[PDB]
Amino acid sequence: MEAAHSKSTEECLAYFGVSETTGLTPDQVKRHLEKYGHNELPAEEGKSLWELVIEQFEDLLVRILLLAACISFVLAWFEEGEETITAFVEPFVILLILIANAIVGVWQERNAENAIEALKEYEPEMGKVYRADRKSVQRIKARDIVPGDIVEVAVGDKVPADIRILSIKSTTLRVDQSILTGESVSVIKHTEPVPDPRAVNQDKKNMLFSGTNIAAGKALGIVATTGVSTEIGKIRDQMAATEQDKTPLQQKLDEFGEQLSKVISLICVAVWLINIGHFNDPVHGGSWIRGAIYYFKIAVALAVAAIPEGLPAVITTCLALGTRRMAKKNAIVRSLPSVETLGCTSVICSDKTGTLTTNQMSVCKMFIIDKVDGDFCSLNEFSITGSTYAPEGEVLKNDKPIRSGQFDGLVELATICALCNDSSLDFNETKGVYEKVGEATETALTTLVEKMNVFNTEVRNLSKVERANACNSVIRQLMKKEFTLEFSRDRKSMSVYCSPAKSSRAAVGNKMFVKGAPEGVIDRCNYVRVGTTRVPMTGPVKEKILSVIKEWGTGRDTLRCLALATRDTPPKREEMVLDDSSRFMEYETDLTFVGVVGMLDPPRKEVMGSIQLCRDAGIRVIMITGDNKGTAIAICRRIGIFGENEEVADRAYTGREFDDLPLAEQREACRRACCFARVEPSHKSKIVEYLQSYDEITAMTGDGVNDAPALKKAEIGIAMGSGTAVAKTASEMVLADDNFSTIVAAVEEGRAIYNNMKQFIRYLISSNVGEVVCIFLTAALGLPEALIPVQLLWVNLVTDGLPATALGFNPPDLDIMDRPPRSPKEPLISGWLFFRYMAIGGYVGAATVGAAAWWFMYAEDGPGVTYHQLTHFMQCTEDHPHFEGLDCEIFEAPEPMTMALSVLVTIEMCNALNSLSENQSLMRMPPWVNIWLLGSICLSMSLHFLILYVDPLPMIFKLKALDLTQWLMVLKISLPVIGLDEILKFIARNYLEG
Ligand SMILES: C/C=C(/C)C(=O)O[C@H]1C(C)=C2[C@H]([C@@H]1OC(=O)CCCCCCC)[C@@](C)(OC(C)=O)C[C@H](OC(=O)CCC)[C@@]1(O)[C@H]2OC(=O)[C@@]1(C)O
Ligand SMILES: Nc1ncnc2c1ncn2[C@@H]1O[C@H](COP(=O)(O)OP(=O)(O)OP(=O)(O)O)[C@H]2OC3(O[C@H]21)C([N+](=O)[O-])=CC(=[N+]([O-])O)C=C3[N+](=O)[O-]
Ligand code: NA
C-alpha cells in the first residue's frame, strides 16, 4: 500500500483485511508472503571467482598476448637445439604477465565495496509483530514481515519496514530519519491521514520508514510496503538501474585496442603479401618448416612490439601517487580512473550549507516595534556581534552597546527565543569550541539570548560548559512549557504553549509563543507589541515590517529572517487537538507581533576565491539550498555565482517552479540555471540527466541515503566526510573537510595529472610504433630478428616504465585553471602529432634494423659481409657468399641484437626528454626541469648494463656486452632523434597558428 500516508488507519486495516488487536492469521501470512515476497533487498550479483578470472582475459589486447603466448609455446615445443632452459623462457614470461595482470584484477574486486550492499546496513535482523496465533508480541526475523502485519516499535528500535502508524502508546513519538530526509532533530509523528497523495517523505508525519530509528516513544503500526517497495528499496532500485559510462580515457584505450588489433592483422597480411615470391620457389628443396617458424616468430614479436605492456601499471602508479597527494588536500578519491573525469568537470552542483557556507548560524540583526501612531511608525533595530555559537558578544544600537533588558519588547523577544526552541548549547571540552545541539537556526536563537541577558544574571562567575545555558535557564524557570506544536512546511511556523510557573490553579495567564517564516506568521498577527502595550496590526505597520525583512533577506545582508509572535489569549488547554497537525495553524492565529531576528550562515573564507577559479576555468557552479528563492539568489550574488546587478529570473528556480515547467523547458532551465532553492531528492537526479543531455561532465554533492541515486548518476559523485557511509560508497570522491574549495582544488589537480598522463601515454605508445616498424622492416627485408619478444617486454615494462612514470611528475602549466574544460572527445594523438610519431617511429624502426645489420656487415667484430645480403638467404644449404668453411649460426649472434636493443633503449631515453613538452624546445624547456626524469634515465641505463653483465641475464635475453667502439655507434644513430623532434617541434610552433 504505497499511498498509506493518505489513508486513514481504518482504511489501511480494511485494505489488508486485518484486525489491529489480533493481527494476521497463518493463512494470511502465507498468502501475503507469496504475493509480496520477503522483506529484504535482493541479493548481490553472484560473481564467482572463476567468472572473475575469465573476465581478466576479455580485453582485446590480452587475447592477442595469450594467442602470442600459445604460438610462442608451440615454437618452443618444436624447435632446433638442445637448450630447453632457454627455449621456454619467452612463453613463460608472456604467461606470467597475463597471470600477474589477472591476480591484480581479481584482487581489485575482493577489496571493492558497492553502495547497494551498503544499504543492507539499514535493515535490522529482527522486528516485533502481533499475529493471530499468539496473544503476546512475537519477535521475528525482519525478512518474514509482510505488508498487513501489525508491527510494534519502541525507543532504540530500527524500523523494519515502511509502516503506517496506527496508535502512539506514549505521550509522543520521536524518530531519527536523518538518513532519508536530512532532518537534523528527531521528528514528531502523528496518526492522522496526510491528504496529498504526492506528499514528500518529510510531510509523511504518519509514516515510519524502513531503516530509520525510534528516538523516543512506543508505537503500534501496520506494514504498508516491504522489500524493494519501501522508500529505501526505491532508492536501491534507482541505483541498480543506473549504468555508469566508462571515463574518456578508458573509451580511448578501448578504441586504441580495437584499432591496434586491426593494424596487427593488416601487417601480418602485408608481411605475407611481400613474400608471395615464395610461391615461385621450387617445391623440392628449401625448408618449409623453418620458413613457417620465421613467419610465426615475427607474428609473436609483432604482437609484443605493438602492445604497451607496461602502460596499465604506469597509469595506476601515477593515479595512486596523485591520489595520496589529493588526500593531503582533503580530497579522498575512491575511484582512481575518476581523477581524469574530475579534470573534465564542466558543472559543479553543490549543496550550500556546510559546503559553500560554514553551517555556523549567527543572529546579527533584530528589531521590535518602537511606536505606532496612525500613519506613522518606527522600529527599534539592533545589531549583534559574534559569529560563533559562543555566547561571546554584545547587542548594539547605532553601533553603541545597550542593555537589552532596558527594552521590554526585547525581554519578550528573548522569552520567545528561549522557549519556542527544541535546541540547546554545549561546549565540547575535547574540541575546545562551542557546538550546536539540534537545528542550526534554533541554536542561534539560544546563543542570542545568552548575549542579550535580559535580566542581567551573573555569567562571568561560571565556566564554559556552565554558562552555555545560563540566560536560557532563567527564562525556563519563568514559564512552564505545557507542549509544543512542531514546525511544519505548510504553515512554516512552530509554537509552544506556556503557563506561568508562579501561578497554581488559575483561569488566565497562559501564552503561546510562536516562531517561523515571516510571511505566514505576520498575516496571522492581529496585534503589535509596543513595549508592554498592544495595538492593532494595521497596514502602515505591516508595510514597515515587511520592508525591513525584504531588505535583510534579499539585500547584501543575506539573512534568514524569523518572525516572533505571541498569542496573548490562547485557546483553552482542553480545547486543543494535539494529534492533528492540520489544526496547528488555527491554534496559532490572532497573534501579537513581537519582532524579527535575522541570522547569517557565512560563506567559507575560501569559497569566493574558488568560485572565481571556476569562472576562469569555464566551470559552471550551481547552488542547491533550502533557503527561500529570494535569499538563495541574494547568497549567490554574495559569493559570486551571480553578479551583483545582473538579471536572474530565468537562472534560478524553486522545486515548485521547476515542476510546473514542461519537460522541454525543464531541460533548457538546467543549461542556464545556477540556483535551485527548495528541491527534493528526485530533482538532483533530474538535474544530472538534463546536464548529461548537453554532454556536461557533472560533479554533484550529497550526504544521505537519499542522495545516493544522484551521486551514482553524476560523472563525479561527491560525498561529505561527515555524511553517511552509503553516500560515500556511491561516490567517486569524499570531502574530508566538506569544503567546496576542496572540489575546485581537486579539479585543478586532476587537470594537471591528465596533462602529464597524456605525455607518458604518448611516450609509451610512440615507442611501440617504433618497435613495430623494426619488426615489419626485418620481416619485409628478410633480415634476422633484430629484436626478440623477451627484450621487447623488458623495454616496455622496465626500461621505458621508469621514464614514463617520471613524466608523470612533469611540472604543470601555469595557465592550468585559465582554460575551458577539456573536451571528452579530444584525441590523444592526431593531426601533426600523428605525423610526428610516424616520423619518430619510422626513424626508430630504421635505426634498430640498421644497427643490427651494421654489425653483420660494416663492423670490426662482425663477419664483414658488406653489401652481401642476409636478405639473400638464411638457408645455409647453398654456400654462395661463403666459399670455404661452414659457419651459419652467426646469423643468430647475440651482438647485433644487443646493438639493436641498446639503440632502442638509448633513443627512448632521448624520446622521454622529447616528451617533457609537446611543442617546446629543450632550449626553452630544459631536461633538468624534471629531476625525477633525469634520475629515472640513470636508473634505466644501469638496469640495461645489469642485463649485459650479470651472468644469468645476458644468456636469457640473448645479449653480450658491447665494445666502447660499438657503444659510440649506438650514440651516433640514437642521439639525432632529439634533432628530428626538435625540427618537428619548430614547425608546429611557427607554421601552425591557432
Ligand atoms: C601503436 C602501434 C601500431 C602498430 C599501430 O600502427 O598504431 C596505430 C594505432 C592503433 C593508432 C595510431 C597508430 O597508427 C599508426 O601508427 C600509423 C599507421 C602505420 C602503421 C605502421 C605499419 C608498419 C597512433 C598510435 O598513431 C601514432 C603515429 O601515434 C595514434 C592514436 O593513438 C592514440 O591516440 C593514443 C590512444 C590512447 C590512434 O590513431 C591509434 O588508433 C586510434 O584508436 C587512435 C586515435 O587512438
Ligand atoms: N521545502 C520547504 N518548504 C518550506 N520551508 C522549507 C523548505 N525547505 C526548507 N525550509 C525551511 O528552511 C530552513 C533551511 O532548510 P534545510 O533543509 O534544513 O537546510 P539545508 O537546505 O541547508 O539542508 P542540507 O544541509 O543541505 O541538508 C529550515 O529552517 C526551518 O524550516 C526550514 C525549520 N526547520 O526545518 O525545522 C524550523 C524553523 N523554526 O521555526 O525555527 C524555521 C525554518 N525556517 O525559517 O526556514
Ligand atoms: Na557517480
Report DSSP letters for 835-870, one per residue.
HHHHHHHHHHHHHHHHHHHHHHTT-SSS---TT--T
Q: Do 214 and 159 form a contact (C-beta atoms < 8 A)?
A: yes
Dihedral angle at the C-alpha atoms of 75, 79, 83, 85, nearest 10 degrees? 10
Specify the 3-state DSSP secondary structure of 194. Answer: coil
SS (H, E, C) 638-675: HHCCCCCCCCCCCCEEEHHHHHCCCHHHHHHHHHHCCE
State the ligand closest to the CA atom of 440.
2
Dihedrals phi, psi of 56, to nearest 5 degrees: -75, -15
Determine whether 351 is an active site residue: yes
DSSP state of 619: -
The annotation status of 304 as a binding-site residue, yes or no, is yes
Q: What's the order of all strands across the beta sheet hosting 187-189?
A: 187-189, 173-176, 213-216
Range 359-602 has CATH code 3.40.1110.10:
yes
Of 87, 219, 235, residue with least CA distance to 164 = 219
In a 10 Å sphere around its CB, with 0-12 CB exposed, 13-18 middle and 19+ buried, how is residue 639 labelled? buried
Counting from 1 in the atom list of ligand 1, the atom nearest the Cα of 828 is 34
Class of the CATH-defined domain 55-112+241-345+746-994: mainly alpha
CATH number, span 346-358+603-745: 3.40.50.1000
453: alpha, beta or left, given left = phi > 0 and alpha = psi -120 to 50?
Answer: left
Which secondary-structure segment (H or E) carries 60? helix 60-77
Whole-angstrom distance, CA of residue 218 vs CA of residue 159: 12
Which secondary-structure segment (H or E) carries 313? helix 311-328
Angle at 867 between CA 862 and CA 872, to 5 degrees: 95
The annotation status of 2 as a binding-site residue, yes or no, is no
Whole-angstrom distance, CA of residue 644 vs CA of residue 640: 8
State the ligand closest to the CA atom of 733.
3
826 Cβ closer than 6 Å to some ligand 1 atom: no
Dihedrals phi, psi of 497, to nearest 5 degrees: -100, 125
The annotation status of 627 as a binding-site residue, yes or no, is yes
All residues at 6 or more sequence positions from 183 whose CB lies less than 8 Å from its CB, including other chains: 177, 202
Whole-angstrom distance, CA of residue 378 vs CA of residue 364: 20
All residues at 6 or more sequence positions from 408 whose CB lies less than 8 Å from its CB, including other chains: 531, 532
Name the CATH architecture for the domain at 12-54+113-240: Distorted Sandwich (2.70)
The annotation status of 157 as a binding-site residue, yes or no, is no
Q: Looking at this protein, which amino acid is placed at residue 889?
A: E
Task: Report, in this order, helix, strand and coil percent for the chain, each rounded to 5.
Answer: 50, 15, 35
**Residue 248: C-alpha distances to residues 126, 161, 245, 349, 442 (Å):** 46, 41, 9, 21, 47
**Residue 884: C-alpha distances to residues 285, 880, 881, 887 (Å):** 22, 10, 9, 9
Angle at 521 between CA 519 and CA 524, to 5 degrees: 110
**Residue 558: C-alpha distances to residues 234, 349, 549 (Å):** 37, 21, 10
Dihedrals phi, psi of 906, to nearest 5 degrees: -70, -50
The greatest distance separating any two alpha carbons of the chain, rounded to the nearest whole angstrom, comes to 135
Q: Do 408 and 532 form a contact (C-beta atoms < 8 A)?
A: yes
Q: Whose CA is nearest to atom 9 of ligand 1?
A: 260
Residues with CB under 5 A from ligand 3 (ion): 714, 717
Q: What number of other Cβ atoms are within 10 A of residue 223's Cβ? A: 31
Counting from 1 in the atom list of ligand 1, the atom nearest the Cα of 761 is 37
In a 10 Å sphere around its CB, with 0-12 CB exposed, 13-18 middle and 19+ buried, how is residue 787 labelled? buried
Specify the 3-state DSSP secondary structure of 700. Answer: strand
Terminal-residue alpha carbon distance, the chain: 64
Do 346-358+603-745 and 12-54+113-240 have the same topology in CATH? no
**Residue 71: C-alpha distances to residues 77, 91, 294, 299, 853 (Å):** 10, 8, 12, 9, 27
Q: What number of other Cβ atoms are within 10 A of residue 826's Cβ? A: 11
Whole-angstrom distance, CA of residue 704 vs CA of residue 234: 15
Domain ranges of the chain: 12-54+113-240, 55-112+241-345+746-994, 346-358+603-745, 359-602
> All 3 cell numbers of residue 321?
601517487
Whole-angstrom distance, CA of residue 348 vs CA of residue 918: 30
Give distance in angstroms: CA of 181 to centre of ligand 1.
Answer: 52
Of 793, 785, 911, residue with least CA distance to 852 = 785
Whole-angstrom distance, CA of residue 630 vs CA of residue 781: 78
Q: What number of other Cβ atoms are within 10 A of residue 672's Cβ? A: 11
Q: Do 163 and 221 form a contact (C-beta atoms < 8 A)?
A: yes
Per DSSP (E only), the strands in 860-908 are: none
Check 157, 351, 601, 981 and give the catalytic one: 351
CB-defined site of ligand 2, < 6 Å: 182, 351-354, 439, 441-442, 487, 489, 492, 494, 515-517, 562, 625-626, 678
> All 3 cell numbers of residue 387?
559569529
Which secondary-structure segment (H or E) carries 55? helix 49-55
Which secondary-structure segment (H or E) carries 373? strand 362-373
State the ligand closest to the CA atom of 699.
3
> All 3 cell numbers of residue 378?
518606527
Q: What number of other Cβ atoms are within 10 A of residue 879's Cβ? A: 14
Of 722, 667, 724, residue with least CA distance to 692 = 667
**Residue 517: C-alpha distances to residues 456, 549, 582, 756 (Å):** 30, 10, 18, 53
In a 10 Å sphere around its CB, with 0-12 CB exposed, 13-18 middle and 19+ buried, how is residue 376 labelled? exposed
* Ligand 1 pocket test target in 262, 776, 834, 911 with most atoms within 8 Å of CB: 834
